[PDB]
RNA sequence: GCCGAUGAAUGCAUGAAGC
RNA sequence: GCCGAUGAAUGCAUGAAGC
RNA sequence: GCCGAUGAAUG
RNA sequence: CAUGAAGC
């Protein structure tokens, strides 16, 4: 689909777990509208995009945009899992990390692992 | 009606305030069904009957039963107010106090005011 | 799956024919709830279990129990056919023969063919 | 939101009707 | 027509939840 | 319970 | 456009 590279589930789980952790020591935007706004304003440190989005055009612009902004993005399998990770009661098509908090190093590890694809 | 005497509203509010006060340090049975059971078993110390109960036949037996069991009963105007007094979320057609808790003396005063009719 | 032996469709049709014929001179329990109670009460002479039960935990306990109660059980293909055989309007997951009626000998032949498996 | 002491869930009995 | 033995109407125990 | 980040209430 | 978890 609108997917520009495959992502290992090891990495996926690493990322989602990091997203939960950032929620308490950092800042996160959740939902495509917020995330697009964040990337546009150049606040996004790592953006998450779910792969099971129907219709696709809802997240279709996000990979293209992140790459023009040279903002790292990473894909995850289910929007349900991303909804759970940002701490909401509904599925979440995309999200983003805006302020890392204390997790300077973990996020460094993860974004570096993402370039490797 | 099934009403055998009018009750000064002073007496009524004293009764209701008493009932909330008992809810937490003593024992109260709520609903016509539980109430009738308490009276039948000789456990009821004071029963409350709402006057606005329709159909009346739902609480009609309670006065007569109390009188053959020598249980003091008192009438109150609204079942809504009685529900609120026993701390349930719906109106309550009748209720009963089974264990006075610490509020022995006030209960004496109230039953005495009831005898006065 | 709860199926503990294969049953020849020859035997299955025999058993269902016997069940239709008894529902008229004997007694039959129909539906898992009733049938289980009948087995637990030690009244069941033969229990029928449909194989196409979804989810299986509805009838899964029945073999173990019949085994504890020394009750013969026999398996059949469809819950619809079992519903039809006990004479009801909906599919039937399990049933039991409680009183053989006139069919002492036939029910004996059938329980015998069942030991052979 | 709705529903519930004018009796919720539940338990036990029942077991083909209900709308 | 829909629904129902994968349990309808129901009786009783019970008493604050259920959706 | 239904609904809601595929965006609630709102401005 | 702004805001972003409630509303019923
Ligand atoms: Na035996
Ligand atoms: Na069929
Ligand atoms: Na029941
Ligand atoms: Na009932």
């Amino acid at each position: 689909s609108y997917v520009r590279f495959e992502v290992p589930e090891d990495m996926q789980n690493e990322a989602l777990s990091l997203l939960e952790k950032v929620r308490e020591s950092g800042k996160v935007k959740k939902g495509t509208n917020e995330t697009t706004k964040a990337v546009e304003r150049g606040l996004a440190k790592l953006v998450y995009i779910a792969e099971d989005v129907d219709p696709p055009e809802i997240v279709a612009h996000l990979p293209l945009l992140c790459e023009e902004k040279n903002v790292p993005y990473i894909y995850v399998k289910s929007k349900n899992d991303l909804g759970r990770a940002v701490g909401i009661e509904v599925p979440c098509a995309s999200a983003a990390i805006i302020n890392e908090g204390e997790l300077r190093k973990e996020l460094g590890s993860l974004v570096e692992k993402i370039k490797g694809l």
Side-chain angles (χ1 to χ4, degrees), chain A residues 3 12-13 31 37 39-40 42 46-48 54 80-82 87 97 101 112 114-116:
Chain A
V3 182
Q12 296 191 12
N13 302 336
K37 221 62 183 160
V39 178
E40 289 177 333
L46 163 68
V47 316
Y48 295 59
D54 190 84
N80 314 321
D81 285 8
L82 191 44
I97 306 179
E112 285 303 312
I114 290 170
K115 276 196 175 176

Side-chain angles (χ1 to χ4, degrees), chain A residues 1 7 13 23 31 33 54-55 65 71 74 88:
Chain A
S1 194
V7 176
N13 302 336
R23 266 175 51 217
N33 260 310
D54 190 84
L65 185 63
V71 172
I74 185 181
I88 73 177

Side-chain angles (χ1 to χ4, degrees), chain A residues 26-46:
Chain A
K27 287 190 182 297
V28 160
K29 284 302 190 178
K30 39 195 77 174
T32 298
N33 260 310
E34 305 186 5
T35 299
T36 308
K37 221 62 183 160
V39 178
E40 289 177 333
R41 299 162 177 168
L43 305 162
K45 307 264 173 295
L46 163 68

Side-chain angles (χ1 to χ4, degrees), chain A residues 50-94:
Chain A
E51 303 179 306
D52 60 338
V53 183
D54 190 84
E57 34 261 42
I58 292 176
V59 300
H61 60 287
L62 266 190
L64 294 76
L65 185 63
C66 289
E67 268 161 9
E68 299 166 8
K69 304 293 175 183
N70 293 283
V71 172
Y73 60 117
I74 185 181
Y75 295 105
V76 288
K77 295 296 180 195
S78 95
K79 46 186 188 179
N80 314 321
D81 285 8
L82 191 44
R84 289 189 201 107
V86 296
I88 73 177
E89 300 151 309
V90 297
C92 168
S94 72

Side-chain angles (χ1 to χ4, degrees), chain A residues 99-104 106-115:
Chain A
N99 185 318
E100 64 204 3
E102 318 164 350
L103 313 185
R104 179 205 320 119
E106 300 77 337
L107 175 71
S109 299
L110 182 54
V111 304
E112 285 303 312
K113 284 190 269 200
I114 290 170
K115 276 196 175 176

